[PDB]
């Protein structure tokens, strides 16, 4: 077949849905790999590194997509009503695989449906063991947890680790991670790596284990223990998200009141409403001496690492549906990773969203 | 004068202690002996022994030298103290486990004006019942002077590599 | 007796020569502690946090320094033709203590002489064992070493540690630290605790061991070929080689930068002294050959909330010995080698 990966046109999107390693896997499966010129610049992947891997370079997005049987993209295709009709570049009846944001972006679903594109919403990857290697949310939110701490330390005018010194004892920074997670668990680990005293909370019971496994202090009706820790906290990282519904409010404005000056909040759910009210998307707000960070698209801040993984999730999702040197792709419907993520098909939105 | 010991008989001491205070120095860092040190420690805590780490201001060769290594070895911070905070607790502690540290304990700084360390505050590890020193040989530390604690009734030299010596101890503590 | 601590007025300077802790111990010595309102805001030290320790809060600079017998500042006072005349705000005959850069800033020294101010240049602290707790160079450039890795991490589009996940593995970042003083060692420490593969090199002898006492590899197998082999596979490169009052030695040249991978960065902590990389510009994140040449200015001020307490307690360690009547009168004992070794001017006379 013919497979195409365009550059991401949306503002601030530096990731790309491919890497040189995954190119070599695709050609080996019997694919022609098309990649738009400069798509991997934000992810530190040269066009040279892709040609060397076996891929073909297209000058424009349209060209790359024109003859593409299968299309790999990071974020949803932009419609005509958004200034760049990317949907019109995909060949009719072609397959689409990307982070569609299907449930919160229905006009894009119709646009694709109207072109008879069979689009797979990668974000709905069912919660099973074999499909975690296909899971884009974990893979990417994992980097977000890491980056959430690197952003913490960058805005923090104190040091993370404890340090006994001729000039006195530099105390260890105190981190409180809201919502254990792929993201949350990765925040915990990176913070502890830096030398901070990490604490953590979440509504899920079995949390304690993985938190304590990392050597983090799981907080143990129960809410009053956080307010007692949050006041001692230097870096507060919140990661709690809800599918479709807005983000939970774990840190209110009066909570910020009780925090030390020079004390940071990384609200990773900023885009989904935020876990902190005064956290604003794409900004660093200074409130009550507390810096409230609400960066948009955090996985894009680790583009060079975020991209190659994202590409493997797709590779993992696709591979078992290739025949044996038959040079054909066919997504076995009865497979639940296919069934659960197919949002639209053959000109009809064949999914629970009437 | 010089009282020497082994890992096998170094374990007879700390097993038969009610409170031990760990004093890590630059030699502990050179040997990368920290994972074994943490291992020796929690063996004792599981036996009821009281354990703590006396981290000295200018221990090692940089600020927080000892800290990052112990931090990597997963030593709890609630068991780590600055000179000022634990220096008096050596009274009650009956054993001072000095791993790779030397100048940091040298009383020449407290009672000898000609000493090139004179005036520097030290950890009072001569107060505890027994004083253990892990050390490859009799060589001096950064200061270039010799340490009086070495030739004392309550002091025993554990000559060898801080890593191996600490592993040997853990294995003698089985 | 009174001691005053102003707000640092130099652009970029967010440190302060005071902390809640050293106020308490200054009051116990018989001092009336006075500070300019908002002087410690840049170090996360609120005005009420000082009065909590026993400090007096003055509204302005001049309305705090005119009355002070001793003055604690972080960094040299500005002169008339430098922006704002702070030297003039100090009381005649008062004692000054801060980072002067005297042997490089003779004009601020003479400006003090005129006003008969006794000044003590904290950076000329003799390197003796007991006086390590007074050394500002060591306390400050240590946090610079920590910051460098944090900035590097920030500028890098990849993660530092190795991460194995459900969908493959990202490799660890490869770090290379040029020159191993207090800063190099702390960088290595932060880099390696972060999860990166840390390499380090230095022209010094007992460095190899010191580097190895952190987990890092000292580059030694046609010598800089061993250096190069590593530098090309490198992702982040931190340079710390600062010669005393001389220009920073060149360690990463243009053609050495061209060899580096696109996405790689260079944190140059020698910028202000010429740079260890001559392709680096002060205060600027330059981009060349797909490589970020980071050259932030005044690095410890980027860790201001932790640098200021260390600076304050440095200043306190130096002063404490010389205060007594029972405790309410300062007399710097010139006998003390720390005093004579650091005093730059006194009673309208250069020393
Ligand atoms: N921390 C700082 O910021 C800094 C900066 C400058 C100077 N210093 C100086 O360095 C000293 C540091 O304190 P310290 O307590 O660590 O004293 P030290 O002077 O560093 O003593 C180190 C001791 O460890 C031993 N050692 C070295 N390698 C070893 C190994 N592989 N296994 C077992 N032992 C080993 C040495 O003797 P053997 O080789 O015979 O075993 C030596 O006696 C202070 O005097 C301080 O003034 C510190
Ligand atoms: O697995 P995944 O990481 O993909 O899941 P996810 O990314 O969808 O969820 C992230 C985490 O947020 C947590 N969370 C949700 N609401 C919370 C609340 N009110 N308080 C604390 N934590 C909360 C969840 O338990 C989960 O661990």
């Amino acid at each position: 077949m013919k497979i195409a990966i365009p550059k991401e046109r949306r503002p601030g999107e530096d990731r790309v849905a491919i890497s040189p390693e995954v190119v070599k896997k695709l050609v080996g499966l019997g694919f022609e790999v098309i990649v738009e010129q400069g798509a991997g610049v934000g992810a530190s992947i040269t066009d040279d590194a892709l040609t060397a891997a076996g891929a073909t370079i297209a000058s424009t997005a349209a060209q790359a997509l024109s003859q593409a049987d299968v299309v790999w993209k990071v974020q949803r295709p932009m419609t005509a009503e958004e200034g760049t009709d990317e949907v019109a570049l995909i060949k009719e009846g072609a397959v689409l695989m990307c982070h569609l944001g299907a449930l919160t972006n229905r006009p894009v679903v119709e646009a694709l449906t109207k072109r008879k594109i069979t689009a797979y919403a990668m974000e709905l990857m069912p919660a099973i063991s074999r499909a975690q290697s296909m899971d884009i949310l974990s893979s990417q939110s994992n980097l977000a947890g890491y980056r959430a701490v690197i952003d913490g330390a960058y805005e923090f005018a104190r040091a993370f680790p404890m340090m006994m010194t001729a000039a006195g004892t530099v105390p260890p920074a105190r981190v409180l991670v809201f919502g254990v997670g792929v993201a949350g668990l990765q925040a915990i680990a990176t913070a502890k790596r830096l030398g901070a005293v990490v604490m953590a909370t979440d509504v899920r019971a079995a949390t304690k284990e993985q938190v304590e496994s990392l050597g983090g202090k799981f907080i143990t009706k129960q809410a009053e223990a956080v307010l007692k820790e949050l006041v001692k906290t230097d870096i507060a990282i919140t990661t709690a998200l809800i599918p479709g519904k807005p983000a939970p409010v774990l840190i209110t404005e009066e909570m910020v009141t009780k925090m030390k000056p020079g004390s940071v909040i990384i609200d990773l759910a900023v885009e989904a409403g935020g876990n902190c009210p005064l956290s604003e998307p794409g900004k660093i707000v200074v409130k009550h001496g507390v810096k409230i960070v609400g960066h948009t698209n955090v996985p894009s801040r680790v583009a060079a690492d975020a991209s190659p993984l994202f590409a493997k999730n797709l590779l993992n999702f696709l591979t078992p549906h290739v025949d044996k040197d038959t040079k054909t792709l066919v997504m076995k419907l009865e497979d639940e990773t296919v069934s659960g993520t197919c949002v639209t098909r053959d000109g009809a939105i064949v999914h629970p969203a009437l | 004068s010089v009282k020497a010991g082994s890992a096998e008989d170094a374990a007879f001491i700390m097993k038969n202690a009610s409170k031990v205070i760990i004093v890590p120095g630059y030699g502990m860092a050179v040997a990368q002996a920290q994972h074994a040190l943490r291992e020796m420690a929690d063996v004792l805590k599981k036996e009821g022994v009281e354990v703590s780490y006396a981290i000295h201001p200018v221990a090692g060769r940089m600020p927080g030298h000892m800290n990052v290594l112990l931090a990597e070895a997963n030593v709890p911070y609630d068991e780590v103290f600055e000179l000022e905070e634990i220096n008096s607790s050596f009274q009650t502690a009956d054993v001072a486990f000095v791993i790779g540290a030397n100048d940091v304990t040298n009383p020449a700084a407290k009672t000898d004006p000609s000493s090139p360390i004179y005036g520097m505050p030290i950890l009072d590890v001569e107060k505890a019942g027994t004083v253990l020193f892990i050390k490859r040989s009799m060589a001096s530390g950064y200061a270039g002077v010799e340490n009086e604690l070495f030739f004392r009734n309550n002091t025993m030299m554990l000559f060898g590599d801080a890593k191996k010596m600490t592993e040997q101890i853990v294995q003698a503590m089985n």
Side-chain angles (χ1 to χ4, degrees), chain A residues 138 141 178-183 201-204 239-242 248 250:
Chain A
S138 63
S141 65
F178 288 78
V180 173
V182 176
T201 177
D202 191 355
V203 189
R204 292 203 277 95
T239 77
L241 169 66
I242 305 295
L250 298 83

Side-chain angles (χ1 to χ4, degrees), chain A residues 160-166 168-169 172 192 194-197 214-215 217, chain B residues 55-58 62-65 67-68 71 74 77-78 80-82 84:
Chain A
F160 264 61
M162 190 180 74
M163 244 176 330
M164 318 269 205
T165 298
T169 304
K192 196 58 190 161
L194 272 175
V197 190
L214 304 170
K217 302 295 182 291
Chain B
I55 285 46
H56 192 278
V58 290
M62 43 144 205
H65 195 176
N67 294 108
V68 63
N74 289 105
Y77 277 141
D78 53 74
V80 185
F81 308 92
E82 61 195 309
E84 302 89 312

Side-chain angles (χ1 to χ4, degrees), chain A:
Chain A
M1 302 62 83
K2 208 156 166 68
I3 189 155
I5 302 85
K7 179 172 177 298
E8 291 294 305
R9 290 293 167 180
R10 272 212 170 75
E13 188 42 74
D14 281 317
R15 298 170 293 171
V16 67
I18 200 164
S19 72
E21 195 197 322
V22 183
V23 171
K24 299 170 100 179
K25 298 284 191 192
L26 259 26
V27 172
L29 293 177
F31 284 74
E32 299 173 55
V33 181
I34 328 297
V35 175
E36 167 169 27
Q37 171 187 57
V41 163
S44 302
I45 306 303
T46 56
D47 285 10
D48 158 57
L50 303 172
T51 53
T56 279
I57 293 174
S59 308
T60 187
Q63 169 173 49
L65 275 29
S66 63
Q67 283 195 159
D69 300 311
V70 43
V71 174
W72 277 10
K73 191 172 170 61
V74 187
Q75 264 154 62
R76 63 203 166 89
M78 289 180 74
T79 56
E81 304 90 73
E82 290 165 304
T84 306
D85 193 345
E86 295 179 310
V87 173
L89 307 182
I90 314 312
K91 188 198 300 168
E92 297 187 68
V95 311
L96 179 67
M97 305 188 184
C98 71
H99 186 301
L100 212 57
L103 295 185
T104 71
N105 303 292
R106 289 200 76 269
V108 180
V109 166
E110 293 169 61
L112 292 168
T113 295
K114 289 177 186 179
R115 295 192 68 79
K116 324 298 188 173
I117 305 294
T118 293
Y120 297 102
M122 294 297 98
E123 74 272 13
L124 313 175
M125 195 64 59
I128 68 167
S129 287
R130 66 187 180 75
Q132 297 311 283
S133 64
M134 310 165 184
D135 200 67
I136 55 161
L137 287 175
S138 63
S139 75
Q140 299 293 289
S141 65
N142 213 24
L143 278 308
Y146 159 85
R147 191 69 204 182
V149 189
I150 293 303
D151 287 356
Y154 193 77
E155 298 304 324
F156 202 38
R158 287 171 184 283
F160 264 61
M162 190 180 74
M163 244 176 330
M164 318 269 205
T165 298
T169 304
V170 173
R174 192 165 289 275
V175 178
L176 206 191
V177 177
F178 288 78
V180 173
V182 176
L185 287 163
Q186 185 46 62
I188 287 164
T190 308
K192 196 58 190 161
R193 274 176 158 290
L194 272 175
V197 190
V198 185
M199 290 191 98
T201 177
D202 191 355
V203 189
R204 292 203 277 95
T207 290
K208 177 179 263 168
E209 199 74 42
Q210 292 175 344
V211 173
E212 296 192 341
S213 305
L214 304 170
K217 302 295 182 291
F218 185 57
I219 298 172
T220 61
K221 175 181 278 290
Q222 193 256 30
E224 215 105 296
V226 175
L227 181 62
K228 294 184 83 177
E229 228 305 308
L230 185 74
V231 294
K232 306 174 65 172
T233 287
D234 294 300
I235 274 80
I237 306 167
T238 80
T239 77
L241 169 66
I242 305 295
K245 298 173 179 178
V249 41
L250 298 83
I251 313 175
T252 68
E253 189 153 355
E254 293 306 302
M255 300 187 84
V256 184
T257 297
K258 313 306 178 175
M259 296 184 83
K260 299 148 63 173
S263 184
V264 178
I265 304 176
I266 292 84
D267 181 0
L268 290 189
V270 56
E271 278 154 290
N275 300 153
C276 180
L278 31 78
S279 80
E280 290 161 30
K283 287 184 170 59
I284 302 192
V285 195
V286 191
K287 286 285 187 292
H288 317 292
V290 186
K291 307 179 77 174
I292 332 297
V293 182
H295 283 308
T296 52
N297 198 356
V298 176
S300 192
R301 310 175 78 73
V302 208
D305 257 23
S307 288
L309 286 173
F310 193 97
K312 284 175 181 179
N313 290 303
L314 300 180
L315 180 62
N316 293 342
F317 176 57
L318 174 141
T319 297
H321 299 103
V322 190
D323 272 55
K324 295 295 177 181
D325 205 52
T326 308
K327 200 190 86 72
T328 189
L329 196 281
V330 46
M331 302 297 262
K332 301 166 288 186
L333 184 281
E334 52 266 63
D335 186 313
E336 61 174 298
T337 60
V338 176
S339 151
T341 77
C342 199
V343 169
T344 177
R345 206 196 292 107
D346 299 309
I349 303 171
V350 195
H351 177 73
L354 283 178

Side-chain angles (χ1 to χ4, degrees), chain B residues 60-88:
Chain B
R61 291 282 197 277
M62 43 144 205
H65 195 176
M66 301 304 110
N67 294 108
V68 63
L69 301 187
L70 299 173
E72 194 212 51
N74 289 105
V75 184
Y77 277 141
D78 53 74
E79 319 200 326
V80 185
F81 308 92
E82 61 195 309
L83 174 157
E84 302 89 312
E85 206 166 44
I86 191 167
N87 183 91
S88 68

